[PDB]
């Protein structure tokens, strides 16, 4: 069941007990969770942004635990408005969140916000960094240690343009696809990368392999091409929520996206075992992450 309808049209809406385990049943099975009423307003002072010239460089980017805007130049006032867009993002989802997934409690913690105002379907980029080519999330100059990549998205686009997704396969399906094109990493490279600064952290084996899975899988064109897939059109004024270091996706088309992430702990989930982290575990029969807590 790939995606996954609800009704809820406000972002403080209360949810019945049902509709919170329908979204976590849901959301850790690797559906997309989709909200076709619950949009995100801008104030008339904000309607400016739609543009995409405020791109400088990295996609627009607001940290709400640091209060920092990052990837925009301008006059303070223009930043000041544009922080407060992206602040109100954080706030309105992070509230929603803690509505839908008490489960999580306080395990959910909020990362970068971004505004995505170039269109989609201009871009052209390599194959690894293609975004119309089916992935999960795996950015080699941030490793997660295993955490989970969570992620709320709003299509804000103001003349009622839709942004056409593609949602493949299980994560379980995707592994085992590539499973015979995995490699171990060579020795020292990943302690090496750490200490010239290329990645944020130590690129732990998980993080390695889920690399290996986003890029091999991006090059594999048969299996971009065949492999099970459906395409959904999102419209102007939904929202959406996803695993998407879980969830297969491919976007091919839209303009003017709000996107905000969380990390989640593996052993806050409902059902671990689902989680990319434990399915890599499994298939590999090793521990990838060293830093893992030990249980008794």
Request: aromatic share 12%.
């Given at each position: 069941q790939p995606i996954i309808q609800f009704d809820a049209e406000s972002w403080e809406a209360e949810f019945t007990q049902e509709i919170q385990d329908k979204a976590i049943e849901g959301l850790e099975s690797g559906s997309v969770l989709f909200f076709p009423k619950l949009n995100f307003p801008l104030l008339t002072e904000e309607l400016?942004?739609?543009?995409?010239?405020?791109?400088?460089?990295?996609?627009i980017s607001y940290d709400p635990r640091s209060a920092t805007l990052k990837g925009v130049e301008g006059k303070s006032e223009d930043l000041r408005l544009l922080s407060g867009l992206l602040k109100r993002y954080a706030e309105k989802t992070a509230a929603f969140l803690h509505l839908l997934f008490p489960f999580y409690g306080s395990s959910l913690k909020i990362a970068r916000t971004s505004f995505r105002p170039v269109e989609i379907s201009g871009r052209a980029t390599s194959a690894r960094k293609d975004d119309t080519r089916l992935h999960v999330d795996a950015f080699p100059s941030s490793p997660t240690g295993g955490e989970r990549i969570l992620r709320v998205f709003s299509n804000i686009n103001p003349q009622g343009k839709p942004r056409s997704w593609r949602i493949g396969e299980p994560f379980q399906n995707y592994l085992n696809h590539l499973l015979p094109q995995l490699s171990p990493p060579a020795p020292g490279k990943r302690f090496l990368l750490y200490l010239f600064g290329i990645t944020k952290g130590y690129r732990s084996l998980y993080d390695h392999y889920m690399l290996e899975l986003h890029d091999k899988g991006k090059l594999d064109l048969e299996y971009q091409k065949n492999s099970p897939q459906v395409a959904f059109d999102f419209p102007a004024g939904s929202t959406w929520i996803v695993f998407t270091d879980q969830v297969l996706h491919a976007v091919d088309k839209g303009q003017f996206l709000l996107e905000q992430t969380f990390h989640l702990k593996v052993?806050?989930?409902?059902?671990?075992?689902?989680?990319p982290l434990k399915l890599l575990e499994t298939a590999?029969?090793?521990?990838?992450?060293?830093s893992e807590s030990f249980k008794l």
């Amino acid at each position: 069941q790939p995606i996954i309808q609800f009704d809820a049209e406000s972002w403080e809406a209360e949810f019945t007990q049902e509709i919170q385990d329908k979204a976590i049943e849901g959301l850790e099975s690797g559906s997309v969770l989709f909200f076709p009423k619950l949009n995100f307003p801008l104030l008339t002072e904000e309607l400016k942004f739609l543009d995409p010239t405020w791109v400088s460089g990295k996609n627009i980017s607001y940290d709400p635990r640091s209060a920092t805007l990052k990837g925009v130049e301008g006059k303070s006032e223009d930043l000041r408005l544009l922080s407060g867009l992206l602040k109100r993002y954080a706030e309105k989802t992070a509230a929603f969140l803690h509505l839908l997934f008490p489960f999580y409690g306080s395990s959910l913690k909020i990362a970068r916000t971004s505004f995505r105002p170039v269109e989609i379907s201009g871009r052209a980029t390599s194959a690894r960094k293609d975004d119309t080519r089916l992935h999960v999330d795996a950015f080699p100059s941030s490793p997660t240690g295993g955490e989970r990549i969570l992620r709320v998205f709003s299509n804000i686009n103001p003349q009622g343009k839709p942004r056409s997704w593609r949602i493949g396969e299980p994560f379980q399906n995707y592994l085992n696809h590539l499973l015979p094109q995995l490699s171990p990493p060579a020795p020292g490279k990943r302690f090496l990368l750490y200490l010239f600064g290329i990645t944020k952290g130590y690129r732990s084996l998980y993080d390695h392999y889920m690399l290996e899975l986003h890029d091999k899988g991006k090059l594999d064109l048969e299996y971009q091409k065949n492999s099970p897939q459906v395409a959904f059109d999102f419209p102007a004024g939904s929202t959406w929520i996803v695993f998407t270091d879980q969830v297969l996706h491919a976007v091919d088309k839209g303009q003017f996206l709000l996107e905000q992430t969380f990390h989640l702990k593996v052993n806050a989930l409902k059902h671990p075992e689902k989680s990319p982290l434990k399915l890599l575990e499994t298939a590999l029969n090793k521990k990838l992450v060293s830093s893992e807590s030990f249980k008794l």
